Amino acid sequence: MAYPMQLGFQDATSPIMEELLHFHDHTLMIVFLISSLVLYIISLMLTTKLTHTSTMDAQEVETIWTILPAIILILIALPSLRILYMMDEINNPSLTVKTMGHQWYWSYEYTDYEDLSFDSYMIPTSELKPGELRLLEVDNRVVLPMEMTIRMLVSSEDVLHSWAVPSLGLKTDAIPGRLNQTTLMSSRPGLYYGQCSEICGSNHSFMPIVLELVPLKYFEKWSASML
């Protein structure tokens, strides 16, 4: 999760989110450099009493205007598209979990072996336990095995929602009649939070996601205990 006065991304929990951090660093360096250059040139154009007001020839300078931006966009698109295809690559998941959005809570189905399903609701503020996070905790966490490739399938049984976990680089819309796939692989155990990311009515702000990453053996005993 986010921490107070945060400026940038949540720390990466997955290799793909690591990749997104370094791609963002690359792209933000370009954004800074172009913004700074435009501001500097504005200041340069506005700080001289020297004048030249007769017609100026444009075609020389428009070659620079267009080629250098074109090269910059190629230098953004190459790593961008490398990551887009890395995300898409065939990976062989160990586990499939489904999530169904609802107004206003998430359900989870783990149906590779046994009929395991449950609802996951926000903890009301007035019920938080000392040290728990307002608007982010849920009664029943999405327990999952660490260090394993997981297939998440996302749908909805009512309006649109969208199932997000920033520190894993995940956001997949929850659309009724559709079954969207993403892959999740945590490098670490822990608790990883996210929030509904498509306007869905009265309690959109209040249907969070908590993943609870643990070793396979604990996941297996939890799974058995939830039947």
């Binding site: 062989n92 160990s94 586990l95 149906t111 590779d112 399903s117 749908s155 997949t172």
Partner: protein, 75 residues
């Protein structure tokens, strides 16, 4: 069996038809096997795959409709 494997027929984020096809395949195999008094165990792979991928409410709805006579897929 751990979960449903990658299927080159359905390589994209939209997995709806993967769920649907495996549900159809299971029920078509089940009808074929029951008709001759064959063995439904031969249909098991499709059962495990659709159970892995398919939302419980989609399976429940489709099962209701097959019983009601309103299932719109061919079995």
């Amino acid at each position: 069996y751990q979960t449903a494997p990658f299927d080159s027929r359905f390589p994209n984020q939209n997995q709806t038809r993967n769920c649907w096809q495996n549900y159809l395949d299971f029920h078509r195999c089940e009808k074929a096997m029951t008709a001759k008094g064959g063995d439904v165990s031969v249909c098991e792979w499709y059962r495990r795959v659709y159970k892995s991928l398919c939302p419980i409410s989609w399976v429940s709805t489709w099962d209701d409709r097959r019983a009601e006579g309103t299932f719109p897929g061919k079995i």
